[PDB]
Structures are given as C-alpha cells and as structure tokens.
C-alpha cells in the first residue's frame, strides 16, 4: 500500500528486501539497477555503532576513517571521493541541508533512525546537487499503530553515558491516529584529554489517516550538542615516523581547555503527505525546515615550529553561524500498464533554499610541547575578521519511468536543475553571485532470471556547485560525475541470503586544480574512480546471520595542474574487506544468548596528494555478547555487552595532509540494558 517515497520491504535481521532510495518508490533490491545497501536497526544495534558514519563500517565501497575517531561530523567516503563527503546525508527523503562550506553540518543520532539505505555513484536525476560517490538516506522511526514503549541505558569506558526512551502507539479509538516520541540524553568523554561529548534530543511524530487513501505525517527533531567532543588533527612526522625518538599520545589534546567550545543546536520541523487518487495515480509531498546555531572556538596544531624543537604551531578558528534552510519535494506517480509493459512513471518538483550567516575569527596562539605539554596560555594574535552571508537556491524538475516487461526491468531518468549560490562578504561588502542550469540523465537495464539471478547495466550522472574561486573570485562552473556500472545481484527463492557484485567506472570533470605557487584556481581537472564491490548477506540457521564485503578502488587524478596527474588521492584504500557474525541459542541452558563478532580490514592510505608515504593497512576486531533474560522469565528486558577494536590498537585513521593525521578510535566498550512493554 502506497509505495511512493516508501521502502516497504521486509527486514530479516541484517538484510532488507526493498528500497526506494534509488527509485523514490518501493522497488525490491533484486529488480533495481543500482548498487544499494541497507543497514538495519539490528545491524546498528548488534554492531554497536554510535554514528551514521560508524554504522557503515561493515559496508563495501565506504571509507569510515576520513577524520579518524571524531564523532562531530559524518564523513562517509563513497568509492574514494572524500572532497565534500559531509554533504551526503539525506533524511526521510530530503537533503540534510548543511553547509559543507561552513561549520554548520548536521548529525542525526542513530537512535532516531530505524534504517539506512545507501545508493552508490551519480544519483542526481532524482536528488539533484549530489556527489559522484553516491548518497545515504536515513529512514527515521515512524509512528507505530499499537503500543511500543522502551527505555535504554548504556555505560561504557571513556565515561560514556547513554539514556533514551522510545514511546509509540495509537491515540485513536479507530487507530487512524498514531504518535511516536523518541528522546535521548547522551554524555561521553572521548579517548582525547579535556574533551566531553553531549547531546540532548527529542522527536515528536504524529501520523493521521484522513481517508483510506490519504495520510499526513508530522515530523519534529530538536537536538542540542553543547559539546562537540574532538575534531583536531596532529602531523605525520610524529605519528607515522618517530619525531626525534618519541611519537604522540592516543589521547593527545592539541587545543586549550580554557578556550574549547562546540555548540550545535539543531531545530528541524517537517511533514510527509501521502494521497492516493486512483490505483494508478498516487502523489506525495515531503517538506522540512531547519534552524541551526553553531558556536565554535578551537585552537589547533598546524605543523612543527622551526624555532622550537618539539612544539607545534597553534592557530585559532572561531565561528558564530545561524543557518536557515527548507526543502520540499512534490512527486506524482502513475502505476499503469500498456500491452505487456507495467509503466511506473514519476514526475517530480523539488526546491530547497539555504542561507547561512557566519562570523569567522582566526589568529595565532602559543606553541604546544607535543610530548607531555603544558596548557594555560590562550591569548590570540587575531587576524582580520571574515564575515559572510551564503545563500543557495535550487529548483528541480525530474521525470522517471520504470518499465516492467517480461523479465526485463528498465529505469529511465531525466532532471533539470536551476541553482543560484551567493557569497556576500560582510567584512568587505563584495558579493559573488552565480546561477546554473545543468541536465542529468540515468538509464538502467536488468534481466531477472526465474532462479533469482539478475545482471544489470546502468549509466547515470551527477552535478555539484564547485567550492572554489574563478581567479576572479567567483564560483567556478560545477563538477560533473558520469558512471558506467555493471553488476550481478542474486538470491535463491527459498533463501534468506543476498549477493551483490558491482563493477563501476566514474569520471568526475571540472574539479578545481591550479599551478602550485600560483594560487588562482582553474576548472579543467578530472578524477577517475573504478573498481568492484562484492557484498554478501547469508542466513544459515534461525540463530546464524553473516555479512561479508570486499572493495577494490582505483581512484586517480586523470588531470591536475597541481603536479599530481596519475597521483591517486589520500584517504582512499585501494582494497577493503569486512566480516560480521552473530549466533543466538534456540533452546537449552544458553537460550536467549547471542554471541557476535567480526573484523574490518582497510588497505593503504596515502598521507598526501603528492603521494610521499602510505599509511599502515589496519585491521580491527569487534565483538559482543547479549542475553535476552526474557528466557529466565523477565519478558521485555534484555542486556547487550559490546567492545570495538578488541585489540585496542593505536593506529592512525588517515591524513588530509602531512601536517594533519587522524588517530584511530581505541577499544570502545558497551554494556546496555533495555525493557520494553
Ligand atoms: O583536521 C581536521 C579535519 C578536517 C578539517 O577540520 N578541516 O579543516 C577541513 C577538512 C575537511 C572538510 C570537511 N568539512 C567539514 O568538516 C566542515 C567543517 C570543517 O571542519 N571545515 O573545515 C569547514 C569549515 C570552513 C572554514 C575553513 N577552515 C577554517 O575556517 C579553519 C579550519 C577548519 O576547517 N577547521 O575545522 C579547523 C582546523 C582544525 C583541524 C581539525 N580537523
Ligand atoms: Fe575543518
């Protein structure tokens, strides 16, 4: 029922059957001509992820470690495209609406979600401004039409506090009206010294059934991060090498406790409206408005001091940003048939308007003795202020037809966009003002075999506004992703196991490169990613579940005046592989017990785009044990005990630069308890 803007599959533990992220209507994973991965609530829960970015540790084509063990932002690197990777999250069908050009990027706390879909490659024909990596859609919890009431509390190493509830049920006699109220306060320290994480989040949801054929859902999300944990980055020289014989803490705080602040207040409001006209015509409208306050004040290590032996330079950055943004998507779907062809035709109009105000401050601070340092001097030789107002408008009209004929399943997509990005410098009084029309197209064919085997070709296209200056101080013409993808999807009919293989080849044009001392960017640049993703979910018995993934990424600068042509980028492991298992007990003394575990393997990261040194291929173990002490005879009460990186390793995640390497997260430990009623 409905299926326009709805997934409507069946999840069985770690595997789902349908997804619309590649479709904007429920189409089963096995018939869709794109690379989709679903991360279930159970996957997130069992695997003890604290972050959207953490959830996808076990997913092929995804690099989790762009900024290492810092839970401030969600850096998801899809197929080795890391430039812009914060701008990749879609919430309940609509863009997150952050500013990857300021500090105002959002975090959706997994507790509020129940499902993560992930699409790969150029995904713009339905979504618009997007990356050639792909994108990630968070389907949050919706109202349940019968009482579900649960409370949690997790304690962990690193002084981790979590406590949350999730209440839902019908308010109505006729049960046409249902609600949901999620909420969670959440503390933590981090491995890092003098950093504290906080979050306080609530989420009311009200779902109404007016007719049999019409349903309006009302959405609200308030989230307060009074502290942002850690976000610094320390040099290659004392991490990858020894720096004069010693080489930095796994807890090293490059900042200043005196002057350490991160304050993000996320206030969202929206609705999803669904109306069925005919058994042919259904139309949906999704809207969201966002309002976010970000206050930063960080002092950070930028490379070694010439004049002091074992101390780093420290520079200040400070922000007060208020962002306003609203996005709407209006769709119109005809399910109809014409001779043997089942036409599933969508036309769509989406509009998003964003406006950021930014007050940026910066300067010099004291240097810091990198091994066993002393804190206390916190004056700043400020630089000039830099205050902007950034606007962005985006109007999108798109049209899509899924043709079912015999065993063939065809996807056609066409989209027009009209973008307008503005950057008024309030300090200078100078405003850059650029407008763009670009046209994207997708085309995807797949034969479904009666045995449940399905090859598919697919060609798709991406676009996104450049983040650079036209050596005239103007936004450059936007970057363009093109993809050939070939793949093989398979599921025997009486199995609960699913197999994906993807061959991809993605070129991305007009990416900002220049002559090195010369500092005036030109847009003739090109990046080329190709490879093969292998993803496997398998049931053996009712208690056994498995995940296995393999990823080969050949990413190159096909053009760069940087001097880096033929240079493969940093933060892009050529190979990657992961595995996860979970065993429960049917009957006997161990019934209600679930032991689980797996491992992740990352390949070699380059520290720099000139490719001067690689980063140790690191390889981590995650484990857990859970007793549903409901088998004792306390029904609805259950405990989990999880631990990540069981070998408590001190590795670096990756490096942006040689001056900037990010530490891998240490052994995280959970113990958590749940009652339901
Ligand atoms: O090294 C890192 C990770 C990467 C990083 O923070 N960057 O500077 C930029 C690299 C990644 C781009 C992904 N975008 C974001 O994470 C959005 C927020 C962010 O951290 N940004 O860099 C974007 C802010 C735009 C302003 C440009 N930079 C600054 O004002 C100070 C440096 C700046 O951008 N900072 O946040 C402070 C620099 C301190 C380094 C601590 N963190
Ligand atoms: Fe930054």
mmCIF file with all atom_site columns, N, CA, C and O in Angstrom, residues 288-332:
data_model
loop_
_atom_site.group_PDB
_atom_site.id
_atom_site.type_symbol
_atom_site.label_atom_id
_atom_site.label_alt_id
_atom_site.label_comp_id
_atom_site.label_asym_id
_atom_site.label_entity_id
_atom_site.label_seq_id
_atom_site.pdbx_PDB_ins_code
_atom_site.Cartn_x
_atom_site.Cartn_y
_atom_site.Cartn_z
_atom_site.occupancy
_atom_site.B_iso_or_equiv
_atom_site.pdbx_formal_charge
_atom_site.auth_seq_id
_atom_site.auth_comp_id
_atom_site.auth_asym_id
_atom_site.auth_atom_id
_atom_site.pdbx_PDB_model_num
ATOM 1   N N  . UNK A 1 288 ? 10.573 19.873 4.824   1.00 0.00 ? 288 UNK A N  1
ATOM 2   C CA . UNK A 1 288 ? 11.390 20.043 6.051   1.00 0.00 ? 288 UNK A CA 1
ATOM 3   C C  . UNK A 1 288 ? 11.896 21.486 6.086   1.00 0.00 ? 288 UNK A C  1
ATOM 4   O O  . UNK A 1 288 ? 12.281 22.024 5.004   1.00 0.00 ? 288 UNK A O  1
ATOM 5   N N  . UNK A 1 289 ? 11.865 22.070 7.286   1.00 0.00 ? 289 UNK A N  1
ATOM 6   C CA . UNK A 1 289 ? 12.539 23.344 7.629   1.00 0.00 ? 289 UNK A CA 1
ATOM 7   C C  . UNK A 1 289 ? 13.531 23.080 8.762   1.00 0.00 ? 289 UNK A C  1
ATOM 8   O O  . UNK A 1 289 ? 13.204 22.266 9.677   1.00 0.00 ? 289 UNK A O  1
ATOM 9   N N  . UNK A 1 290 ? 14.721 23.682 8.642   1.00 0.00 ? 290 UNK A N  1
ATOM 10  C CA . UNK A 1 290 ? 15.866 23.551 9.584   1.00 0.00 ? 290 UNK A CA 1
ATOM 11  C C  . UNK A 1 290 ? 16.315 24.927 10.079  1.00 0.00 ? 290 UNK A C  1
ATOM 12  O O  . UNK A 1 290 ? 16.257 25.867 9.319   1.00 0.00 ? 290 UNK A O  1
ATOM 13  N N  . UNK A 1 291 ? 16.798 24.981 11.312  1.00 0.00 ? 291 UNK A N  1
ATOM 14  C CA . UNK A 1 291 ? 17.267 26.191 12.007  1.00 0.00 ? 291 UNK A CA 1
ATOM 15  C C  . UNK A 1 291 ? 18.377 25.766 12.943  1.00 0.00 ? 291 UNK A C  1
ATOM 16  O O  . UNK A 1 291 ? 18.094 25.056 13.885  1.00 0.00 ? 291 UNK A O  1
ATOM 17  N N  . UNK A 1 292 ? 19.611 26.145 12.651  1.00 0.00 ? 292 UNK A N  1
ATOM 18  C CA . UNK A 1 292 ? 20.770 25.674 13.447  1.00 0.00 ? 292 UNK A CA 1
ATOM 19  C C  . UNK A 1 292 ? 21.779 26.769 13.798  1.00 0.00 ? 292 UNK A C  1
ATOM 20  O O  . UNK A 1 292 ? 22.356 27.416 12.915  1.00 0.00 ? 292 UNK A O  1
ATOM 21  N N  . UNK A 1 293 ? 22.078 26.767 15.086  1.00 0.00 ? 293 UNK A N  1
ATOM 22  C CA . UNK A 1 293 ? 23.089 27.598 15.754  1.00 0.00 ? 293 UNK A CA 1
ATOM 23  C C  . UNK A 1 293 ? 24.311 26.734 15.992  1.00 0.00 ? 293 UNK A C  1
ATOM 24  O O  . UNK A 1 293 ? 24.160 25.659 16.617  1.00 0.00 ? 293 UNK A O  1
ATOM 25  N N  . UNK A 1 294 ? 25.458 27.189 15.481  1.00 0.00 ? 294 UNK A N  1
ATOM 26  C CA . UNK A 1 294 ? 26.798 26.577 15.708  1.00 0.00 ? 294 UNK A CA 1
ATOM 27  C C  . UNK A 1 294 ? 27.699 27.660 16.270  1.00 0.00 ? 294 UNK A C  1
ATOM 28  O O  . UNK A 1 294 ? 27.885 28.677 15.569  1.00 0.00 ? 294 UNK A O  1
ATOM 29  N N  . UNK A 1 295 ? 28.244 27.438 17.464  1.00 0.00 ? 295 UNK A N  1
ATOM 30  C CA . UNK A 1 295 ? 29.292 28.298 18.069  1.00 0.00 ? 295 UNK A CA 1
ATOM 31  C C  . UNK A 1 295 ? 30.529 27.449 18.308  1.00 0.00 ? 295 UNK A C  1
ATOM 32  O O  . UNK A 1 295 ? 30.460 26.461 19.017  1.00 0.00 ? 295 UNK A O  1
ATOM 33  N N  . UNK A 1 296 ? 31.625 27.837 17.688  1.00 0.00 ? 296 UNK A N  1
ATOM 34  C CA . UNK A 1 296 ? 32.895 27.109 17.751  1.00 0.00 ? 296 UNK A CA 1
ATOM 35  C C  . UNK A 1 296 ? 33.852 28.057 18.406  1.00 0.00 ? 296 UNK A C  1
ATOM 36  O O  . UNK A 1 296 ? 33.557 29.248 18.343  1.00 0.00 ? 296 UNK A O  1
ATOM 37  N N  . UNK A 1 297 ? 34.926 27.524 18.977  1.00 0.00 ? 297 UNK A N  1
ATOM 38  C CA . UNK A 1 297 ? 36.144 28.258 19.395  1.00 0.00 ? 297 UNK A CA 1
ATOM 39  C C  . UNK A 1 297 ? 37.243 27.227 19.604  1.00 0.00 ? 297 UNK A C  1
ATOM 40  O O  . UNK A 1 297 ? 37.296 26.642 20.676  1.00 0.00 ? 297 UNK A O  1
ATOM 41  N N  . UNK A 1 298 ? 38.057 26.959 18.595  1.00 0.00 ? 298 UNK A N  1
ATOM 42  C CA . UNK A 1 298 ? 39.072 25.877 18.704  1.00 0.00 ? 298 UNK A CA 1
ATOM 43  C C  . UNK A 1 298 ? 40.447 26.461 18.401  1.00 0.00 ? 298 UNK A C  1
ATOM 44  O O  . UNK A 1 298 ? 40.579 27.278 17.483  1.00 0.00 ? 298 UNK A O  1
ATOM 45  N N  . UNK A 1 299 ? 41.440 26.004 19.144  1.00 0.00 ? 299 UNK A N  1
ATOM 46  C CA . UNK A 1 299 ? 42.862 26.267 18.841  1.00 0.00 ? 299 UNK A CA 1
ATOM 47  C C  . UNK A 1 299 ? 43.496 24.926 18.455  1.00 0.00 ? 299 UNK A C  1
ATOM 48  O O  . UNK A 1 299 ? 43.297 23.983 19.194  1.00 0.00 ? 299 UNK A O  1
ATOM 49  N N  . UNK A 1 300 ? 44.240 24.859 17.348  1.00 0.00 ? 300 UNK A N  1
ATOM 50  C CA . UNK A 1 300 ? 44.740 23.591 16.755  1.00 0.00 ? 300 UNK A CA 1
ATOM 51  C C  . UNK A 1 300 ? 46.176 23.642 16.245  1.00 0.00 ? 300 UNK A C  1
ATOM 52  O O  . UNK A 1 300 ? 46.610 24.627 15.638  1.00 0.00 ? 300 UNK A O  1
ATOM 53  N N  . UNK A 1 301 ? 46.823 22.491 16.363  1.00 0.00 ? 301 UNK A N  1
ATOM 54  C CA . UNK A 1 301 ? 48.194 22.228 15.892  1.00 0.00 ? 301 UNK A CA 1
ATOM 55  C C  . UNK A 1 301 ? 48.228 22.216 14.363  1.00 0.00 ? 301 UNK A C  1
ATOM 56  O O  . UNK A 1 301 ? 47.602 21.305 13.731  1.00 0.00 ? 301 UNK A O  1
ATOM 57  N N  . UNK A 1 302 ? 48.960 23.174 13.798  1.00 0.00 ? 302 UNK A N  1
ATOM 58  C CA . UNK A 1 302 ? 49.290 23.236 12.356  1.00 0.00 ? 302 UNK A CA 1
ATOM 59  C C  . UNK A 1 302 ? 50.812 23.099 12.141  1.00 0.00 ? 302 UNK A C  1
ATOM 60  O O  . UNK A 1 302 ? 51.531 24.115 12.001  1.00 0.00 ? 302 UNK A O  1
ATOM 61  N N  . UNK A 1 303 ? 51.321 21.865 12.084  1.00 0.00 ? 303 UNK A N  1
ATOM 62  C CA . UNK A 1 303 ? 52.721 21.594 11.700  1.00 0.00 ? 303 UNK A CA 1
ATOM 63  C C  . UNK A 1 303 ? 53.744 22.026 12.740  1.00 0.00 ? 303 UNK A C  1
ATOM 64  O O  . UNK A 1 303 ? 53.406 22.728 13.702  1.00 0.00 ? 303 UNK A O  1
ATOM 65  N N  . UNK A 1 304 ? 54.974 21.520 12.605  1.00 0.00 ? 304 UNK A N  1
ATOM 66  C CA . UNK A 1 304 ? 56.066 21.745 13.593  1.00 0.00 ? 304 UNK A CA 1
ATOM 67  C C  . UNK A 1 304 ? 56.665 23.148 13.485  1.00 0.00 ? 304 UNK A C  1
ATOM 68  O O  . UNK A 1 304 ? 56.780 23.646 12.351  1.00 0.00 ? 304 UNK A O  1
ATOM 69  N N  . UNK A 1 305 ? 57.037 23.723 14.639  1.00 0.00 ? 305 UNK A N  1
ATOM 70  C CA . UNK A 1 305 ? 57.749 25.029 14.765  1.00 0.00 ? 305 UNK A CA 1
ATOM 71  C C  . UNK A 1 305 ? 59.231 24.896 14.369  1.00 0.00 ? 305 UNK A C  1
ATOM 72  O O  . UNK A 1 305 ? 59.921 24.006 14.914  1.00 0.00 ? 305 UNK A O  1
ATOM 73  N N  . UNK A 1 306 ? 59.680 25.755 13.445  1.00 0.00 ? 306 UNK A N  1
ATOM 74  C CA . UNK A 1 306 ? 61.086 25.875 13.010  1.00 0.00 ? 306 UNK A CA 1
ATOM 75  C C  . UNK A 1 306 ? 61.964 26.104 14.243  1.00 0.00 ? 306 UNK A C  1
ATOM 76  O O  . UNK A 1 306 ? 63.019 25.452 14.376  1.00 0.00 ? 306 UNK A O  1
ATOM 77  N N  . UNK A 1 307 ? 61.489 26.969 15.134  1.00 0.00 ? 307 UNK A N  1
ATOM 78  C CA . UNK A 1 307 ? 62.309 27.690 16.137  1.00 0.00 ? 307 UNK A CA 1
ATOM 79  C C  . UNK A 1 307 ? 62.215 27.036 17.516  1.00 0.00 ? 307 UNK A C  1
ATOM 80  O O  . UNK A 1 307 ? 62.931 27.475 18.410  1.00 0.00 ? 307 UNK A O  1
ATOM 81  N N  . UNK A 1 308 ? 61.293 26.095 17.703  1.00 0.00 ? 308 UNK A N  1
ATOM 82  C CA . UNK A 1 308 ? 61.143 25.322 18.967  1.00 0.00 ? 308 UNK A CA 1
ATOM 83  C C  . UNK A 1 308 ? 61.190 23.838 18.620  1.00 0.00 ? 308 UNK A C  1
ATOM 84  O O  . UNK A 1 308 ? 60.400 23.388 17.778  1.00 0.00 ? 308 UNK A O  1
ATOM 85  N N  . UNK A 1 309 ? 62.072 23.037 19.277  1.00 0.00 ? 309 UNK A N  1
ATOM 86  C CA . UNK A 1 309 ? 62.329 21.657 18.843  1.00 0.00 ? 309 UNK A CA 1
ATOM 87  C C  . UNK A 1 309 ? 61.131 20.687 18.787  1.00 0.00 ? 309 UNK A C  1
ATOM 88  O O  . UNK A 1 309 ? 60.914 20.018 17.758  1.00 0.00 ? 309 UNK A O  1
ATOM 89  N N  . UNK A 1 310 ? 60.440 20.536 19.916  1.00 0.00 ? 310 UNK A N  1
ATOM 90  C CA . UNK A 1 310 ? 59.310 19.578 19.978  1.00 0.00 ? 310 UNK A CA 1
ATOM 91  C C  . UNK A 1 310 ? 58.005 20.274 20.350  1.00 0.00 ? 310 UNK A C  1
ATOM 92  O O  . UNK A 1 310 ? 57.330 19.803 21.264  1.00 0.00 ? 310 UNK A O  1
ATOM 93  N N  . UNK A 1 311 ? 57.673 21.351 19.644  1.00 0.00 ? 311 UNK A N  1
ATOM 94  C CA . UNK A 1 311 ? 56.400 22.063 19.890  1.00 0.00 ? 311 UNK A CA 1
ATOM 95  C C  . UNK A 1 311 ? 55.770 22.327 18.529  1.00 0.00 ? 311 UNK A C  1
ATOM 96  O O  . UNK A 1 311 ? 56.523 22.540 17.569  1.00 0.00 ? 311 UNK A O  1
ATOM 97  N N  . UNK A 1 312 ? 54.445 22.258 18.453  1.00 0.00 ? 312 UNK A N  1
ATOM 98  C CA . UNK A 1 312 ? 53.745 22.562 17.183  1.00 0.00 ? 312 UNK A CA 1
ATOM 99  C C  . UNK A 1 312 ? 53.232 23.999 17.128  1.00 0.00 ? 312 UNK A C  1
ATOM 100 O O  . UNK A 1 312 ? 52.852 24.532 18.176  1.00 0.00 ? 312 UNK A O  1
ATOM 101 N N  . UNK A 1 313 ? 53.090 24.561 15.935  1.00 0.00 ? 313 UNK A N  1
ATOM 102 C CA . UNK A 1 313 ? 52.360 25.848 15.794  1.00 0.00 ? 313 UNK A CA 1
ATOM 103 C C  . UNK A 1 313 ? 50.898 25.614 16.197  1.00 0.00 ? 313 UNK A C  1
ATOM 104 O O  . UNK A 1 313 ? 50.353 24.521 15.928  1.00 0.00 ? 313 UNK A O  1
ATOM 105 N N  . UNK A 1 314 ? 50.269 26.604 16.824  1.00 0.00 ? 314 UNK A N  1
ATOM 106 C CA . UNK A 1 314 ? 48.802 26.577 17.054  1.00 0.00 ? 314 UNK A CA 1
ATOM 107 C C  . UNK A 1 314 ? 48.182 27.881 16.544  1.00 0.00 ? 314 UNK A C  1
ATOM 108 O O  . UNK A 1 314 ? 48.727 29.011 16.808  1.00 0.00 ? 314 UNK A O  1
ATOM 109 N N  . UNK A 1 315 ? 47.091 27.680 15.807  1.00 0.00 ? 315 UNK A N  1
ATOM 110 C CA . UNK A 1 315 ? 46.261 28.704 15.138  1.00 0.00 ? 315 UNK A CA 1
ATOM 111 C C  . UNK A 1 315 ? 44.850 28.583 15.721  1.00 0.00 ? 315 UNK A C  1
ATOM 112 O O  . UNK A 1 315 ? 44.452 27.519 16.230  1.00 0.00 ? 315 UNK A O  1
ATOM 113 N N  . UNK A 1 316 ? 44.121 29.691 15.721  1.00 0.00 ? 316 UNK A N  1
ATOM 114 C CA . UNK A 1 316 ? 42.754 29.771 16.277  1.00 0.00 ? 316 UNK A CA 1
ATOM 115 C C  . UNK A 1 316 ? 41.772 29.828 15.116  1.00 0.00 ? 316 UNK A C  1
ATOM 116 O O  . UNK A 1 316 ? 42.035 30.406 14.059  1.00 0.00 ? 316 UNK A O  1
ATOM 117 N N  . UNK A 1 317 ? 40.633 29.208 15.335  1.00 0.00 ? 317 UNK A N  1
ATOM 118 C CA . UNK A 1 317 ? 39.447 29.362 14.474  1.00 0.00 ? 317 UNK A CA 1
ATOM 119 C C  . UNK A 1 317 ? 38.227 29.526 15.367  1.00 0.00 ? 317 UNK A C  1
ATOM 120 O O  . UNK A 1 317 ? 38.161 28.869 16.392  1.00 0.00 ? 317 UNK A O  1
ATOM 121 N N  . UNK A 1 318 ? 37.334 30.423 15.018  1.00 0.00 ? 318 UNK A N  1
ATOM 122 C CA . UNK A 1 318 ? 36.140 30.643 15.838  1.00 0.00 ? 318 UNK A CA 1
ATOM 123 C C  . UNK A 1 318 ? 34.982 31.016 14.963  1.00 0.00 ? 318 UNK A C  1
ATOM 124 O O  . UNK A 1 318 ? 35.207 31.767 14.020  1.00 0.00 ? 318 UNK A O  1
ATOM 125 N N  . UNK A 1 319 ? 33.785 30.554 15.283  1.00 0.00 ? 319 UNK A N  1
ATOM 126 C CA . UNK A 1 319 ? 32.603 30.790 14.433  1.00 0.00 ? 319 UNK A CA 1
ATOM 127 C C  . UNK A 1 319 ? 31.362 31.043 15.290  1.00 0.00 ? 319 UNK A C  1
ATOM 128 O O  . UNK A 1 319 ? 31.203 30.405 16.343  1.00 0.00 ? 319 UNK A O  1
ATOM 129 N N  . UNK A 1 320 ? 30.521 31.971 14.856  1.00 0.00 ? 320 UNK A N  1
ATOM 130 C CA . UNK A 1 320 ? 29.095 32.002 15.262  1.00 0.00 ? 320 UNK A CA 1
ATOM 131 C C  . UNK A 1 320 ? 28.265 31.909 13.980  1.00 0.00 ? 320 UNK A C  1
ATOM 132 O O  . UNK A 1 320 ? 28.231 32.887 13.240  1.00 0.00 ? 320 UNK A O  1
ATOM 133 N N  . UNK A 1 321 ? 27.622 30.771 13.716  1.00 0.00 ? 321 UNK A N  1
ATOM 134 C CA . UNK A 1 321 ? 26.814 30.584 12.487  1.00 0.00 ? 321 UNK A CA 1
ATOM 135 C C  . UNK A 1 321 ? 25.345 30.259 12.817  1.00 0.00 ? 321 UNK A C  1
ATOM 136 O O  . UNK A 1 321 ? 25.089 29.272 13.548  1.00 0.00 ? 321 UNK A O  1
ATOM 137 N N  . UNK A 1 322 ? 24.408 31.020 12.239  1.00 0.00 ? 322 UNK A N  1
ATOM 138 C CA . UNK A 1 322 ? 22.944 30.723 12.207  1.00 0.00 ? 322 UNK A CA 1
ATOM 139 C C  . UNK A 1 322 ? 22.531 30.312 10.789  1.00 0.00 ? 322 UNK A C  1
ATOM 140 O O  . UNK A 1 322 ? 22.544 31.171 9.890   1.00 0.00 ? 322 UNK A O  1
ATOM 141 N N  . UNK A 1 323 ? 22.094 29.073 10.621  1.00 0.00 ? 323 UNK A N  1
ATOM 142 C CA . UNK A 1 323 ? 21.689 28.619 9.273   1.00 0.00 ? 323 UNK A CA 1
ATOM 143 C C  . UNK A 1 323 ? 20.181 28.398 9.226   1.00 0.00 ? 323 UNK A C  1
ATOM 144 O O  . UNK A 1 323 ? 19.619 27.939 10.204  1.00 0.00 ? 323 UNK A O  1
ATOM 145 N N  . UNK A 1 324 ? 19.573 28.785 8.112   1.00 0.00 ? 324 UNK A N  1
ATOM 146 C CA . UNK A 1 324 ? 18.133 28.576 7.852   1.00 0.00 ? 324 UNK A CA 1
ATOM 147 C C  . UNK A 1 324 ? 18.034 27.878 6.514   1.00 0.00 ? 324 UNK A C  1
ATOM 148 O O  . UNK A 1 324 ? 18.733 28.298 5.593   1.00 0.00 ? 324 UNK A O  1
ATOM 149 N N  . UNK A 1 325 ? 17.227 26.833 6.447   1.00 0.00 ? 325 UNK A N  1
ATOM 150 C CA . UNK A 1 325 ? 17.069 26.100 5.182   1.00 0.00 ? 325 UNK A CA 1
ATOM 151 C C  . UNK A 1 325 ? 15.762 25.334 5.211   1.00 0.00 ? 325 UNK A C  1
ATOM 152 O O  . UNK A 1 325 ? 15.363 24.891 6.264   1.00 0.00 ? 325 UNK A O  1
ATOM 153 N N  . UNK A 1 326 ? 15.120 25.246 4.065   1.00 0.00 ? 326 UNK A N  1
ATOM 154 C CA . UNK A 1 326 ? 13.871 24.473 3.938   1.00 0.00 ? 326 UNK A CA 1
ATOM 155 C C  . UNK A 1 326 ? 13.924 23.753 2.606   1.00 0.00 ? 326 UNK A C  1
ATOM 156 O O  . UNK A 1 326 ? 14.482 24.275 1.661   1.00 0.00 ? 326 UNK A O  1
ATOM 157 N N  . UNK A 1 327 ? 13.422 22.531 2.591   1.00 0.00 ? 327 UNK A N  1
ATOM 158 C CA . UNK A 1 327 ? 13.440 21.759 1.329   1.00 0.00 ? 327 UNK A CA 1
ATOM 159 C C  . UNK A 1 327 ? 12.067 21.137 1.152   1.00 0.00 ? 327 UNK A C  1
ATOM 160 O O  . UNK A 1 327 ? 11.473 20.759 2.140   1.00 0.00 ? 327 UNK A O  1
ATOM 161 N N  . UNK A 1 328 ? 11.555 21.165 -0.065  1.00 0.00 ? 328 UNK A N  1
ATOM 162 C CA . UNK A 1 328 ? 10.278 20.483 -0.362  1.00 0.00 ? 328 UNK A CA 1
ATOM 163 C C  . UNK A 1 328 ? 10.470 19.586 -1.588  1.00 0.00 ? 328 UNK A C  1
ATOM 164 O O  . UNK A 1 328 ? 11.297 19.935 -2.459  1.00 0.00 ? 328 UNK A O  1
ATOM 165 N N  . UNK A 1 329 ? 9.752  18.461 -1.679  1.00 0.00 ? 329 UNK A N  1
ATOM 166 C CA . UNK A 1 329 ? 9.788  17.550 -2.855  1.00 0.00 ? 329 UNK A CA 1
ATOM 167 C C  . UNK A 1 329 ? 8.349  17.175 -3.193  1.00 0.00 ? 329 UNK A C  1
ATOM 168 O O  . UNK A 1 329 ? 7.701  16.605 -2.339  1.00 0.00 ? 329 UNK A O  1
ATOM 169 N N  . UNK A 1 330 ? 7.868  17.537 -4.378  1.00 0.00 ? 330 UNK A N  1
ATOM 170 C CA . UNK A 1 330 ? 6.487  17.188 -4.791  1.00 0.00 ? 330 UNK A CA 1
ATOM 171 C C  . UNK A 1 330 ? 6.572  16.147 -5.898  1.00 0.00 ? 330 UNK A C  1
ATOM 172 O O  . UNK A 1 330 ? 7.114  16.474 -6.935  1.00 0.00 ? 330 UNK A O  1
ATOM 173 N N  . UNK A 1 331 ? 6.015  14.960 -5.681  1.00 0.00 ? 331 UNK A N  1
ATOM 174 C CA . UNK A 1 331 ? 6.089  13.880 -6.695  1.00 0.00 ? 331 UNK A CA 1
ATOM 175 C C  . UNK A 1 331 ? 4.693  13.490 -7.174  1.00 0.00 ? 331 UNK A C  1
ATOM 176 O O  . UNK A 1 331 ? 3.741  13.738 -6.454  1.00 0.00 ? 331 UNK A O  1
ATOM 177 N N  . UNK A 1 332 ? 4.611  12.880 -8.353  1.00 0.00 ? 332 UNK A N  1
ATOM 178 C CA . UNK A 1 332 ? 3.329  12.472 -8.966  1.00 0.00 ? 332 UNK A CA 1
ATOM 179 C C  . UNK A 1 332 ? 3.533  11.163 -9.710  1.00 0.00 ? 332 UNK A C  1
ATOM 180 O O  . UNK A 1 332 ? 4.077  11.219 -10.804 1.00 0.00 ? 332 UNK A O  1
#
